[PDB]
């Protein structure tokens, strides 16, 4: 409290608020509780007869967890989730040039689809943000696994312990495949980003978006990052 807790469903690109126990490490889905306790961890859990597959990040985050939730049985449904305990508004820094580094899970489509899971490796899904608290501005970029150019450009404004803004692909679109010839591209010109700063003194930040547009493409993303030393 206050606690962001969201699930993003991949099939219909929707965002739902989850019930919670004021605990980022406790995922409360379908009335039951899953403990999210190197970098990422992957596991299965059955409770009440229901089987869940969970991939969660990150070992180095203490106030924020994000990842993939797969409900299996008769129907395999895929979701992303993010949970974080917001930093008290009075504890929000006023510094400029604060760098946060982390990763993201993404699913991007337009006809055909691309997906990528969080990573702490060079060449993996990576996220980087620069927060200018005094300007109340956050900017950042998400880069897809095994891609040279950044994938999403993020810009937002900070209000209290949260931020909101936009995520967009390159103007020429995101190549869904690296086999180029004609290659399918996704164009995300206007995705609405929502996020927060988590933990004491905003040591962590995270956010999410779920976007779809005809003739352009769709994207479902959760990301998280940790404040870096100078």
Short mmCIF file of C-alpha atoms in Angstrom, two decimals:
data_model
loop_
_atom_site.label_atom_id
_atom_site.label_comp_id
_atom_site.label_asym_id
_atom_site.label_seq_id
_atom_site.Cartn_x
_atom_site.Cartn_y
_atom_site.Cartn_z
CA UNK A 1 0.00 0.00 0.00
CA UNK A 2 0.10 1.61 -2.30
CA UNK A 3 0.75 -1.43 -4.48
CA UNK A 4 0.53 -1.71 -8.28
CA UNK A 5 -0.60 -5.18 -9.24
CA UNK A 6 -1.59 -5.82 -12.84
CA UNK A 7 -2.09 -8.74 -15.19
CA UNK A 8 -1.90 -8.22 -18.95
CA UNK A 9 -3.66 -10.89 -20.99
CA UNK A 10 -1.88 -11.71 -24.25
CA UNK A 11 -4.85 -12.84 -26.34
CA UNK A 12 -6.99 -9.71 -25.96
CA UNK A 13 -4.30 -7.21 -24.90
CA UNK A 14 -6.21 -6.16 -21.77
CA UNK A 15 -5.02 -4.92 -18.37
CA UNK A 16 -6.62 -6.18 -15.14
CA UNK A 17 -5.91 -5.10 -11.58
CA UNK A 18 -5.05 -8.05 -9.33
CA UNK A 19 -6.07 -8.47 -5.71
CA UNK A 20 -3.06 -8.32 -3.41
CA UNK A 21 -1.72 -8.66 0.12
CA UNK A 22 0.43 -5.51 -0.02
CA UNK A 23 3.36 -7.71 -0.98
CA UNK A 24 5.22 -7.58 -4.31
CA UNK A 25 6.61 -11.09 -3.74
CA UNK A 26 3.13 -12.63 -3.40
CA UNK A 27 1.14 -13.18 -6.59
CA UNK A 28 -2.59 -13.49 -5.82
CA UNK A 29 -4.30 -15.10 -8.81
CA UNK A 30 -7.63 -16.96 -8.93
CA UNK A 31 -8.15 -16.69 -5.19
CA UNK A 32 -4.91 -18.54 -4.43
CA UNK A 33 -1.37 -17.39 -3.65
CA UNK A 34 1.90 -18.04 -5.45
CA UNK A 35 5.24 -17.09 -3.90
CA UNK A 36 7.55 -15.29 -6.35
CA UNK A 37 10.51 -15.43 -3.91
CA UNK A 38 20.01 -16.70 -10.96
CA UNK A 39 18.52 -13.52 -12.54
CA UNK A 40 15.05 -14.89 -13.27
CA UNK A 41 13.28 -17.95 -11.99
CA UNK A 42 10.91 -20.34 -13.73
CA UNK A 43 8.62 -22.88 -12.09
CA UNK A 44 5.29 -24.71 -12.03
CA UNK A 45 2.82 -24.66 -9.16
CA UNK A 46 -0.43 -26.60 -8.73
CA UNK A 47 -3.07 -25.46 -6.24
CA UNK A 48 -6.76 -26.41 -6.02
CA UNK A 49 -6.09 -28.69 -9.00
CA UNK A 50 -5.07 -25.73 -11.16
CA UNK A 51 -1.61 -25.70 -12.74
CA UNK A 52 0.35 -22.47 -13.19
CA UNK A 53 3.60 -21.88 -15.06
CA UNK A 54 5.48 -18.84 -13.79
CA UNK A 55 8.51 -16.97 -15.03
CA UNK A 56 9.49 -14.05 -12.81
CA UNK A 57 12.18 -11.37 -12.62
CA UNK A 58 14.38 -10.41 -10.88
CA UNK A 59 16.83 -11.65 -8.27
CA UNK A 60 18.12 -8.08 -7.73
CA UNK A 61 14.73 -6.36 -7.26
CA UNK A 62 13.24 -6.27 -3.77
CA UNK A 63 10.13 -4.13 -4.16
CA UNK A 64 9.04 -5.08 -7.64
CA UNK A 65 8.40 -8.35 -9.47
CA UNK A 66 7.38 -8.80 -13.10
CA UNK A 67 7.07 -11.78 -15.41
CA UNK A 68 4.89 -14.28 -17.28
CA UNK A 69 1.97 -16.28 -15.96
CA UNK A 70 0.69 -19.30 -17.86
CA UNK A 71 -2.52 -21.02 -16.74
CA UNK A 72 -2.51 -24.56 -18.10
CA UNK A 73 -5.42 -26.96 -18.49
CA UNK A 74 -8.09 -27.47 -21.16
CA UNK A 75 -7.01 -24.00 -22.25
CA UNK A 76 -3.49 -22.60 -22.19
CA UNK A 77 -3.78 -18.89 -21.41
CA UNK A 78 -0.79 -16.54 -21.33
CA UNK A 79 -0.53 -13.40 -19.24
CA UNK A 80 2.11 -10.97 -18.11
CA UNK A 81 2.08 -9.49 -14.62
CA UNK A 82 3.81 -6.77 -12.62
CA UNK A 83 3.64 -6.04 -8.89
CA UNK A 84 5.40 -3.29 -6.97
CA UNK A 85 5.19 -1.45 -3.66
CA UNK A 86 5.23 2.27 -4.46
CA UNK A 87 7.78 4.58 -2.85
CA UNK A 88 6.20 7.08 -0.45
CA UNK A 89 5.69 10.36 -2.30
CA UNK A 90 7.83 12.25 0.25
CA UNK A 91 10.73 9.88 -0.52
CA UNK A 92 10.78 10.59 -4.27
CA UNK A 93 14.26 11.93 -5.20
CA UNK A 94 14.75 15.35 -6.79
CA UNK A 95 18.00 14.44 -8.65
CA UNK A 96 18.57 14.78 -12.40
CA UNK A 97 20.19 12.15 -14.67
CA UNK A 98 19.24 9.15 -12.51
CA UNK A 99 19.88 6.01 -14.53
CA UNK A 100 17.85 2.83 -14.05
CA UNK A 101 18.82 -0.43 -15.81
CA UNK A 102 16.77 -3.59 -16.11
CA UNK A 103 14.86 -5.72 -18.57
CA UNK A 104 11.41 -6.56 -19.91
CA UNK A 105 9.09 -9.25 -21.22
CA UNK A 106 7.42 -8.45 -24.50
CA UNK A 107 5.07 -9.80 -27.08
CA UNK A 108 4.85 -7.88 -30.36
CA UNK A 109 2.73 -8.73 -33.38
CA UNK A 110 1.32 -7.63 -36.69
CA UNK A 111 0.20 -10.73 -38.50
CA UNK A 112 3.19 -12.69 -37.26
CA UNK A 113 4.63 -12.32 -33.78
CA UNK A 114 7.80 -11.86 -31.78
CA UNK A 115 8.34 -12.54 -28.10
CA UNK A 116 11.20 -12.01 -25.66
CA UNK A 117 11.81 -12.73 -21.97
CA UNK A 118 13.69 -10.70 -19.38
CA UNK A 119 17.46 -11.14 -19.25
CA UNK A 120 20.53 -9.66 -17.60
CA UNK A 121 22.83 -10.64 -20.46
CA UNK A 122 24.41 -8.51 -23.13
CA UNK A 123 22.30 -9.24 -26.21
CA UNK A 124 19.21 -10.11 -24.15
CA UNK A 125 16.04 -8.07 -23.63
CA UNK A 126 17.30 -4.87 -22.01
CA UNK A 127 15.77 -1.73 -20.54
CA UNK A 128 17.42 1.57 -19.65
CA UNK A 129 15.87 4.75 -18.27
CA UNK A 130 17.05 8.21 -17.42
CA UNK A 131 14.91 9.97 -14.84
CA UNK A 132 15.16 13.72 -14.43
CA UNK A 133 13.16 14.08 -11.25
CA UNK A 134 13.47 17.87 -11.11
CA UNK A 135 12.03 18.15 -14.65
CA UNK A 136 9.45 15.50 -13.71
CA UNK A 137 10.51 13.62 -16.82
CA UNK A 138 11.37 10.03 -17.57
CA UNK A 139 12.81 8.80 -20.86
CA UNK A 140 13.99 5.36 -21.79
CA UNK A 141 14.45 2.58 -24.26
CA UNK A 142 13.69 -1.12 -24.45
CA UNK A 143 15.88 -3.18 -26.75
CA UNK A 144 14.86 -6.62 -28.05
CA UNK A 145 17.04 -9.69 -27.59
CA UNK A 146 19.62 -10.13 -30.37
CA UNK A 147 18.75 -6.79 -31.97
CA UNK A 148 21.13 -3.89 -32.49
CA UNK A 149 18.68 -0.96 -32.58
CA UNK A 150 16.37 -0.02 -29.74
CA UNK A 151 12.87 -1.43 -30.01
CA UNK A 152 10.68 0.94 -27.95
CA UNK A 153 11.36 4.56 -27.17
CA UNK A 154 9.69 5.62 -23.94
CA UNK A 155 8.83 9.10 -22.71
CA UNK A 156 6.73 10.11 -19.73
CA UNK A 157 5.97 12.61 -17.00
CA UNK A 158 6.17 11.92 -13.30
CA UNK A 159 3.32 12.58 -10.88
CA UNK A 160 3.97 11.81 -7.23
CA UNK A 161 5.31 8.27 -7.11
CA UNK A 162 4.13 7.27 -10.56
CA UNK A 163 4.67 8.10 -14.19
CA UNK A 164 2.71 7.99 -17.44
CA UNK A 165 3.55 8.47 -21.08
CA UNK A 166 4.08 6.71 -24.38
CA UNK A 167 6.06 3.90 -25.94
CA UNK A 168 6.71 3.73 -29.66
CA UNK A 169 8.63 1.65 -32.17
CA UNK A 170 10.98 3.15 -34.76
CA UNK A 171 9.10 5.11 -37.41
CA UNK A 172 10.11 2.47 -39.95
CA UNK A 173 8.63 -0.17 -37.65
CA UNK A 174 9.93 -3.09 -35.62
CA UNK A 175 11.15 -6.00 -37.79
CA UNK A 176 9.32 -9.06 -36.45
CA UNK A 177 11.95 -11.32 -37.98
CA UNK A 178 15.63 -10.99 -38.90
CA UNK A 179 15.39 -12.95 -42.15
CA UNK A 180 15.57 -10.16 -44.73
CA UNK A 181 13.22 -9.71 -49.29
CA UNK A 182 10.07 -8.66 -47.45
CA UNK A 183 9.87 -8.74 -43.66
CA UNK A 184 6.75 -8.25 -41.53
CA UNK A 185 6.93 -5.14 -39.35
CA UNK A 186 4.95 -3.96 -36.36
CA UNK A 187 4.22 -0.25 -35.90
CA UNK A 188 3.36 0.91 -32.38
CA UNK A 189 2.98 4.66 -32.62
CA UNK A 190 1.04 5.45 -29.50
CA UNK A 191 1.19 2.83 -26.72
CA UNK A 192 0.14 4.20 -23.32
CA UNK A 193 2.71 3.53 -20.64
CA UNK A 194 1.87 3.49 -16.96
CA UNK A 195 4.38 2.82 -14.20
CA UNK A 196 5.70 3.61 -10.75
CA UNK A 197 8.75 3.99 -8.56
CA UNK A 198 9.10 1.26 -5.98
CA UNK A 199 10.91 0.68 -2.70
CA UNK A 200 12.55 3.13 -0.32
CA UNK A 201 13.86 6.20 -2.10
CA UNK A 202 12.67 4.92 -5.51
CA UNK A 203 15.54 2.46 -5.91
CA UNK A 204 13.43 0.58 -8.47
CA UNK A 205 10.92 1.50 -11.19
CA UNK A 206 8.66 -0.49 -13.45
CA UNK A 207 5.77 -0.13 -15.85
CA UNK A 208 3.59 -1.80 -18.43
CA UNK A 209 1.58 -1.30 -21.58
CA UNK A 210 -0.88 -3.23 -23.72
CA UNK A 211 -1.61 -1.85 -27.14
CA UNK A 212 -3.39 -2.95 -30.28
CA UNK A 213 -4.22 -1.13 -33.49
CA UNK A 214 -5.52 -2.42 -36.80
CA UNK A 215 -3.03 -2.18 -39.71
CA UNK A 216 -0.28 -1.26 -37.23
CA UNK A 217 0.21 -4.05 -34.72
CA UNK A 218 0.02 -4.97 -31.06
CA UNK A 219 2.30 -5.15 -28.04
CA UNK A 220 2.09 -6.37 -24.48
CA UNK A 221 5.03 -5.42 -22.25
CA UNK A 222 6.09 -5.34 -18.59
CA UNK A 223 9.45 -3.87 -17.58
CA UNK A 224 11.44 -3.17 -14.45
CA UNK A 225 14.74 -1.51 -13.63
CA UNK A 226 17.04 -0.66 -10.75
CA UNK A 227 18.72 2.64 -9.89
CA UNK A 228 22.40 2.52 -10.84
CA UNK A 229 25.39 3.96 -9.04
CA UNK A 230 27.32 6.82 -10.74
#
